[PDB]
């Protein structure tokens, strides 16, 4: 069945299995192949695979990476995806000197918010947004990838897994150990990524849970009952937290314009209830002049 695919190179390793750049010998299509060894004596097919395949077979959107086929040998399982040219992380490092043109940052954020609204509209939380998981092509698209950590949610939400989201991008409601979290966690991560696209360096590079909180608090101010009702009652909230004043938000990302600042401030709102949804953020004045140009660099 893997009869028609010729391997080119190993791309990387995500949440589970290993990705390869391959091409169909018959159609010429370039694909990515996620390969999962199922030696069996483990615990059968892993829940990460069971989630990624059932969710991705439903999520059909130009800004969600496309699952093309599943090939299911007895002790080996292959997932065939559309292939993209690089990840956002590498692109940012490739733009080390020039920085990214504002129309490309703009476009990228718009597209990312579309893909995410679509996940949220289809009861799916991604739960691991970060530049490593966001893939770009030469034609100007950016797409959400690796739904290994994703899950299907109910309305309203139950308590789900706590060990969640890569740390630099983890929302404060998780860090404070709140029993319920929702779609706002994915927005926080896209908020951090927008900052990162402008500056080319992580907004909150923590080295532990507490250091992460403290880095967030020193930037947006330590939250109180006024800015976030019910903070002081959160399981991992400590009354001994240092109380930092909130920075003039223009200082957080200095090159960002007023409309940019406004958008970023609403993605980074402490209170998950008040934080802007993916749906609403699409209509923000920041995107009034939005186009979809091709990347300014060869990928």
């Amino acid at each position: 069945s893997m009869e028609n695919f010729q391997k080119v190179e190993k791309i990387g390793e995500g949440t589970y299995g290993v990705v390869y750049k391959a091409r169909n010998k018959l159609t010429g299509e370039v694909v990515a192949l996620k390969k999962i060894r199922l030696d069996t004596e483990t615990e059968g097919v892993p829940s990460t695979a069971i989630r990624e395949i059932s969710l991705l077979k439903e999520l059909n959107h130009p800004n969600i990476v496309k699952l093309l086929d599943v090939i299911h040998t007895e002790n080996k399982l292959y997932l065939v995806f559309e292939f993209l040219h690089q990840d956002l992380k590498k692109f940012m490092d490739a733009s080390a000197l020039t920085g990214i043109p504002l129309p490309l940052i703009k476009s990228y954020l718009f597209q990312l918010l579309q893909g995410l609204a679509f996940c949220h509209s289809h009861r799916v939380l991604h739960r691991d947004l970060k530049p490593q998981n966001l893939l770009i092509n030469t034609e100007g698209a950016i797409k959400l990838a690796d739904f290994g950590l994703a899950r299907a949610f109910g309305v309203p939400v139950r308590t789900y897994t706590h060990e969640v989201v890569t740390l630099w991008y983890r929302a404060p409601e998780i860090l404070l150990g709140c029993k319920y979290y929702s779609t706002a966690v994915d927005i926080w991560s896209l908020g951090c990524i927008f900052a990162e696209m402008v500056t080319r360096r992580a907004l909150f590079p923590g080295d532990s849970e507490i250091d992460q909180l403290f880095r967030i608090f020193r930037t947006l101010g330590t939250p109180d009952e006024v800015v976030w009702p019910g903070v002081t009652s959160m399981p991992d909230y400590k009354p001994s937290f240092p109380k930092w004043a909130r920075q003039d938000f223009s200082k957080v990302v200095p090159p960002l314009d007023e409309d940019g600042r406004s958008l970023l401030s609403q993605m980074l709102h402490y209170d998950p209830n008040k934080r802007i949804s993916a749906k609403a953020a699409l209509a923000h004045p920041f995107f009034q002049d939005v186009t979809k140009p091709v990347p300014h660099l060869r990928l």
Binding site: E43, I53, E58, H120, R123, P156, N273
Partner: protein, 262 residues
């Protein structure tokens, strides 16, 4: 706030209404099965209830498992000695989809009381996956019930627990409940529960949401009312037992109304 997903709840409902049709088992399947019966299915579902109770699994997992057993059996004939194996793979799969901490395969072999080997359970999992073609994100009675609960003013825990009780009982009996959709059973269960506890009715706000009225719910609502009244007598009893617990406000002890006054 954001826990009830104000910006997406309508879209999500709309989406679920679409998938519950695509994910519907075929109603006439038991007639076409040579060796298993409605009663043999009852015994199995009742057992899975014990399993869920035994491993403290979510109720959502239970509903998901049964959807899988029902779809698999819509296109696969299975001998009576193997019906439990299908259910065990299904319950294993459901847990992998829905649970933060799912039981391990070794535990699933264990509650089948050494009827089947690990080898079998795993091979069966694989097979259920091929037949369902990995389509495990299925709408359930609870995904709907849970949104309906958002309409009571104010919220009543007796109502909530009773509605889930009645939904769960419907899982046991393929005749008749194999012909109603999750959303309609949820709606019947919600009304019946609400009326039993408060004397109130399926509210105008859910007519707006769902498009269902009492008139379109009546046929299901009439079957559900029967099941409720006959429950203490039903051969299968695990669900009654389960809902005596404080966890669910002991609702299975409540008295069903003698009439629905429809």
């Amino acid at each position: 706030g954001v826990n009830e997903v104000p910006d997406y709840h309508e879209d999500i409902h709309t989406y679920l209404r679409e998938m519950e049709v695509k994910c519907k088992p075929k109603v006439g399947y038991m007639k076409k099965q040579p060796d298993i019966t409605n009663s043999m299915r009852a015994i199995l579902v009742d057992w899975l209830v014990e399993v869920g109770e035994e491993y403290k699994l979510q109720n959502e997992t239970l509903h998901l498992a049964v959807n899988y057993i029902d779809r698999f059996l819509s296109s696969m004939s299975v001998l009576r000695g193997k019906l439990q194996l299908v259910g065990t793979a299904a319950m294993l799969l459901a847990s992998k989809f829905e649970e933060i901490y799912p039981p391990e395969v070794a535990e699933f072999v264990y509650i089948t009381d050494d009827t089947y080997t690990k080898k079998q359970v795993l091979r069966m999992e694989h097979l259920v996956l091929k037949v369902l073609a990995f389509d495990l994100a299925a709408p359930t009675i609870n995904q709907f019930l849970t949104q309906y609960f958002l309409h009571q003013q104010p919220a009543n825990c007796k109502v909530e627990s009773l509605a889930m009780f009645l939904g769960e009982l419907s899982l046991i009996d393929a005749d008749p409940y194999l012909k109603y959709l999750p959303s309609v059973i949820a709606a019947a269960a919600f009304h019946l529960a609400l009326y039993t506890v408060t004397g109130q009715s399926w509210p105008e706000s859910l007519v707006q949401k769902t498009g269902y009225t009492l008139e379109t719910l009546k046929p299901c609502l009439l079957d559900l009312h029967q099941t409720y009244l006959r429950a203490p007598q039903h051969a299968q009893q695990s669900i009654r037992e389960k809902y005596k617990n404080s966890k669910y406000h002991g609702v299975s002890l409540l008295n069903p109304p003698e009439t629905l006054n429809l």
